[PDB]
RNA sequence: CUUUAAAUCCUUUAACGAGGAUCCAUUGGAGGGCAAGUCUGGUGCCAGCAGCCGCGGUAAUUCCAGCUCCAAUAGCGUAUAUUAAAGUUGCUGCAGUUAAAAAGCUCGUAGUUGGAUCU
């Protein structure tokens, strides 16, 4: 008897057909548009939408005035609106079935850093995040797959202890200043 | 056929067999559409109107298109009683 | 046709569990004779002593000599012919050697050309054959 | 020429390769 | 240059018929592929499915001929499936493209749950059947994609079905019987009488009746 | 420094720490199934490859290597158990003329199933 917890869970699912042309092409396009590391980063986001769609497929079978459909149908819509994947006016339960992978991949912090003009490519943004140059309101974030919420989106900046922000110059500028 | 907003979302509305209410399909090449002429009731000459009956191909392959035309035209008063 | 009534549950399940024994996969894995004939005894791998190197002749629509090894297992003393995969891998094998033997892929059936050989060699003298073949390790002296 | 390769070699050892090259030629890519 | 030989091609060429749905409404047989090229045309894409060599034994040896299975389709629209045998693969493919344009049907699309938007799936469960192979199309919700084997997936995506469930039966290794079976199921989507098609059919004039004064000048 | 019983680890901060940034990514493959080379040399039914069909007998798209390319990636092969695929155990949901298969015939207990009809 130990005082631990063994609850864990996988975040992705491998496809059933391992070498299927027109799946490889589409996933490589999704990597290239967003600058992902491998195919598991794509399958991770396929897995969250497949769970969201399974959760909405069962609420759509219950009675329209059932308390579970009204209660968990409104929590599921609130989260999608909050992280910016749905629209405010589209808060019926049937528009969840019209969501796509790219709607979730837009809300990564890496694409938000690229799209807010902090970086100049989708690969400059990941390498900016990973070496501690971006913060969200006070907090330096290291994680490229940080799903930005709609209210915490305009608070993205350059992390005051970084050369691009408050600006003690880096290890390389300091050495070149010492040299000559 | 119709969505919730009320648009008609359908390529076309197919015809139905006038004898047996079956949908006459796109590649139903044995099916018929036949006009039967209407006459003026004092000269017995062709008025200009007609009466359209469509009959699907299975009814005609059954041999029942003759009786079906006959009882459709009998209901319109084109063929008299007896 | 089959019975369908509302009180037919005993007839339905006693017929299915009696017709289940006519399936080859059920009869193999639920009778116990096939497990007592398996020299591994249900294990994935085993270990034996190399008795002699043996050349087995390929089956008719092609022609070669496959380089097998007759090996007597440690845990039950059963004898086994086992195939040594790549070329010049029979050179790595002495006699009276510790050897590690796996299955050959078809779960107890003989893989294509080699007649009646269900097993293959994985390690020799506690060194893997792949490490000897690609030159990563050598046989100890 | 994938057409001529296919029509000559469809029975031989290289039948699957010339079939794949013909399908590559036909269905874009 | 198209010199049409039928009564319908003369009407199609002279701008008297405005859509393919008029010819489908009156179920007229289409004997020239230039009608299809006139109507769909710039949005009609083809895929060769299998080149199949067949052999007849003869007194002198054996003649080898080649069978091409060509599926054509207007995405959101219509789908056809042609098969042609020939002694040469290029002529077999061109003849199968003509014969695939010739056998083009409309496919009715429906809704899985509530009818909000455009139709995206089959209107109901339709089974197609061709030589031991049974293919069944089951309606699926918005966005599942096609859950099928790779052979009906081609024909179904060409037909414009966004998302569907499928179940096959039989010997589906024969790609001919497995392609024509789903084509039989797609062609059944307009023949199924559902309660929205329950209204009485007001009849209109056939194109050979309305344009009987234009057709006599030619 | 903080952490801790005391420590370690992580987190926080000095100083040092990158150009072939040699501060070097691997495991399996490249005829089909199944993404990706009938390029090149060696071998010559041998050695071997190959789950299966097959490759190899002096032009090897399949062996042994070089080069190039493909897939997954700090992971990736192999063996065995097991689940799906299997509507090939079938309640949903299979089959029994000729492919495996219906009892020689009738009787007959249990079992299973049992016609309308009452506000």
What does the H/E/C string look like for E32-65? Answer: CCHHHHHHCHHHCEEEEEEEEEEEEECCCCEEEE
Please report which helix (H) or strand (E) contains residue C36, including its range.
helix C33-37
Q: How long is the CA E196 to C1' F84 vector, in angstroms?
A: 39
Nearest to E116 among A57, A94, A99 (CB): A94
Judged by DSSP in three states, C66 sits in strand
Bridge partners of A149, per DSSP, are none
A122 and A130 Cβ atoms separated by less than 8 Å: no
| Domain of residue C28, residue span | 1-141
Angle between helices A67-82 and A40-59 (to 10 degrees): 150
CA distances from E120 to A52, B12, E159, E164 (A): 20, 17, 11, 9
Which experimental method was this entry solved with? Answer: cryo-EM
Distant-in-sequence, close-in-space partners of E178: CB < 8 Å, separation ≥ 6: E133, E135, E149, E151, E152, E168, E172
Which of B9, B26, B56 would best serve as a mutation to test chain E binding (most E beta carbons within 10 A)? B26
How far apart, in whole angstroms, are the C-alpha atoms of residue C98 and residue C10? 54
Judged by DSSP in three states, E180 sits in helix
Q: How long is the CA C7 to C1' F118 vector, in angstroms?
A: 29
E26 and E206 Cβ atoms separated by less than 8 Å: yes
Nucleotide nearest to C18 (CA to C1'): F89
Q: How long is the CA A131 to C1' F22 vector, in angstroms?
A: 24
Per the structure, how many domains does chain C have?
Answer: 1
How far apart, in whole angstroms, are the C-alpha atoms of residue E28 and residue E22? 9
CB–CB of D7 and E90 under 8 A? no
Nearest to E48 among D3, D10, D27 (CB): D27
CB contacts < 8 A, B to E, total 75
Bridge partners of A139, per DSSP, are A136
CA distances from D17 to C11, D10, D21, D25, E150 (A): 55, 9, 6, 12, 20
How far apart, in whole angstroms, are the C-alpha atoms of residue A42 and residue E199? 49
Q: What is the resolution of this structure in A?
A: 3.0
Q: Would strands C45-57 and A156-157 be described as parallel, antiparallel, or unpaired?
A: unpaired
Q: For tokens 């035309």, name the residue.
A: B69
The residue among C116, C6, C112 whose CA lies nearest residue C54 is: C116
CB–CB of B3 and E117 under 8 A? yes
How far apart, in whole angstroms, are the C-alpha atoms of residue A28 and residue A37? 11
Q: For tokens 């009564």, name the residue.
A: E7
Q: Provide long-range contacts, Cβ within 8 A and 24+ apart, for C30-34.
A: C34/C108
How far apart, in whole angstroms, are the C-alpha atoms of residue A56 and residue A77? 10
CB–CB of E66 and D7 under 8 A? yes
CA angle A131, A134, A137 (to 5 degrees): 145
Show which of residues 3-42 on chain B sit within 8 Å of chain E, judged by CB atoms.
3-5, 9-16, 21-29, 31, 33, 35
């Amino acid at each position: 008897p130990v005082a631990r917890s063994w609850v864990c869970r996988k975040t992705y699912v491998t496809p059933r057909r391992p070498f299927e042309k027109s799946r490889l092409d589409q996933e490589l396009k999704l990597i290239g548009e967003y600058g992902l590391r491998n195919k598991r980063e794509v399958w991770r986001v396929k897995f969250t939408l497949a769970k969201i769609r399974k959760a909405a497929r069962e609420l759509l079978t219950l009675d329209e005035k059932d308390p579970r459909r009204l209660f968990e149908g409104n929590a599921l819509l609130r989260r999608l609106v909050r992280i910016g994947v749905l629209d405010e006016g589209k808060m019926k339960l049937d528009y969840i079935l019209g969501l796509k992978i790219e709607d979730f991949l837009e809300r990564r912090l890496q694409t938000q850093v690229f799209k807010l003009g902090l970086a100049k490519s989708i690969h400059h943004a990941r390498v900016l995040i990973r070496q501690r140059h971006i913060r969200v309101r006070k907090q330096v974030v290291n994680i490229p797959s940080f799903i930005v919420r709609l209210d915490s989106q305009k608070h993205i900046d350059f992390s005051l202890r970084s050369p691009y922000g408050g600006g003690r110059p880096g290890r390389v500028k300091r050495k070149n200043a010492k040299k000559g | 056929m119709q969505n919730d907003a009320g648009e008609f979302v359908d390529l076309y509305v197919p015809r139905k067999c006038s004898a047996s209410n079956r949908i006459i399909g796109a590649k139903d090449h044995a099916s018929i559409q036949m006009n039967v002429a209407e006459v003026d009731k004092v000269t017995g000459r062709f008025n200009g109107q007609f009466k359209t009956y469509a009959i699907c191909g299975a009814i005609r392959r059954m041999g029942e298109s003759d009786d079906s035309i006959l009882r459709l035209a009998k209901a319109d008063g084109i063929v008299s009683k007896n | 046709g089959k019975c369908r009534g509302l009180r037919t549950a005993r007839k339905l399940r006693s017929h299915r569990r009696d017709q289940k024994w006519h399936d080859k996969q059920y009869k193999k894995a639920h009778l116990g004779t096939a497990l007592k004939a398996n020299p591994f005894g249900g294990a994935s791998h085993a270990k034996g002593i190399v008795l002699e190197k043996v050349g087995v002749e390929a089956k008719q629509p092609n022609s070669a000599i496959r380089k097998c090894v007759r090996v007597q297992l440690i845990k039950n003393g059963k004898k086994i012919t086992a195939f040594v995969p790549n070329d010049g891998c029979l050179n790595f094998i002495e006699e009276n050697d510790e050897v590690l033997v796996a299955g050959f892929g078809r779960k107890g059936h003989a893989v294509g050309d080699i007649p009646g050989v269900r097993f293959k060699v994985v390690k020799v003298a506690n060194v893997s054959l792949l490490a000897l073949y690609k030159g990563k390790k050598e046989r100890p002296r | 020429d994938p057409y001529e390769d296919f029509q000559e070699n469809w029975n031989t050892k290289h039948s699957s390769g010339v079939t794949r090259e013909l399908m590559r030629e036909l269905n874009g890519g | 240059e198209w010199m049409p030989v039928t009564k319908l091609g003369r009407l199609v060429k002279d701008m008297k018929i405005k859509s393919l749905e008029e010819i489908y409404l009156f179920s007229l047989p289409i004997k020239e592929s230039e009608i299809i090229d006139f109507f769909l045309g710039a949005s009609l894409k083809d895929e060769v499915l299998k080149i199949m060599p067949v052999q007849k034994q003869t007194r002198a040896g054996q003649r080898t001929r080649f069978k091409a299975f060509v599926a054509i389709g207007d995405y959101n629209g219509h789908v056809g499936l042609g098969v042609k045998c020939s002694k040469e693969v290029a002529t077999a493919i061109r003849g199968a493209i003509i014969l695939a344009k010739l056998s083009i049907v409309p496919v009715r699309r429906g809704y899985w749950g509530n009818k909000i938007g455009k139709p995206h799936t089959v209107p109901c469960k339709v089974t197609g059947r061709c030589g031991s192979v049974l293919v069944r199309l089951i309606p699926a919700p918005r966005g599942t994609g096609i859950v099928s084997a790779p052979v009906p997936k081609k024909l179904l995506m060409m037909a414009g079905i966004d998302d569907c469930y499928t179940s096959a039966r039989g010997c589906t290794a024969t790609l001919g019987n497995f392609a024509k079976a789903t084509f039989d199921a797609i062609s059944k989507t307009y023949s199924y009488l559902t309660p929205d098609l329950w209204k009485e059919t007001v009849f209109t004039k056939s194109p050979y009746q309305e344009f009987t004064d234009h057709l006599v000048k030619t």
